[PDB]
Structure 1
Amino acid sequence: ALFDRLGRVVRANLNDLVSKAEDPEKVLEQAVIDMQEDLVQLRQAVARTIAEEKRTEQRLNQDTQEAKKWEDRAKLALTNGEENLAREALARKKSLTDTAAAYQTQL
Structure 2
Amino acid sequence: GLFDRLGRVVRANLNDLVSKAEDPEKVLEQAVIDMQEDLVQLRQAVARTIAEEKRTEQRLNQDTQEAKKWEDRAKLALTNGEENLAREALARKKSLTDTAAAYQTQLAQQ
| TM-score normalized by the length of structure 1 | 0.71
Q: Residues 77 and 17 (structure 1 numbering): CA distance in 2 closer, same or farther, change over 3 Å? A: same
Q: Extract unaligned runs of 5+ from structure 2.
A: none
Q: Percent identity?
A: 99
Relative to structure 1, the CA distance from residue 19 to residue 74 in structure 2 (aligned partners, 3 Å threshold; closer, same or farther) is same
Shift of 1:14: 4.0
CA RMSD, 1 decimal: 2.9
Shifted more, 10-19 versus 31-40: the winner is 10-19
For residues 8 and 76 of structure 1, do their structure 2 counterparts lie closer, same or farther at Cα, with a shift above 3 Å needed? Answer: closer
> Which moved further from structure 2: 78-87 or 27-36?
78-87
Residue 70 of structure 1, CA deviation: 0.9
Of residues 89-98 and 42-51 in structure 1, the stretch that sits farther from structure 2 once superposed is 42-51
Q: Which sections of structure 1, spanning at least 5 residues, go unmatched?
A: none
* TM-superposed deviation, 1:79: 4.1
Question: Deviation of residue 71 (structure 1)?
Answer: 1.7
Deviation string, structure 1 residues 34-80 (Cα, Å, up to 9, x no partner): 01111221222222233332333233222111111212322332344
TM-score w.r.t. the length of structure 2 is 0.70
Residue 102, structure 1, aligned to residue 102, structure 2: yes
The alpha carbon displacement at 1:7 in A equals: 6.1
Distance in structure 1 (CA, Å) of the matches to 2:101 and 2:10? 62
Q: How many residues align?
A: 107
Q: Equivalent residue for 1:30?
A: 30
Q: Distance in 1 between matches of 2:76 and 2:2?
A: 90
Residues 11-20 or 51-60, more deviating: 11-20
Q: Secondary structure at the match of 2:20?
A: helix
Shift of the 37–83 alpha-carbon distance from structure 1 to 2, 3 Å rule, reads same
Cα pair distance change 1:5/1:74, threshold 3 Å? closer
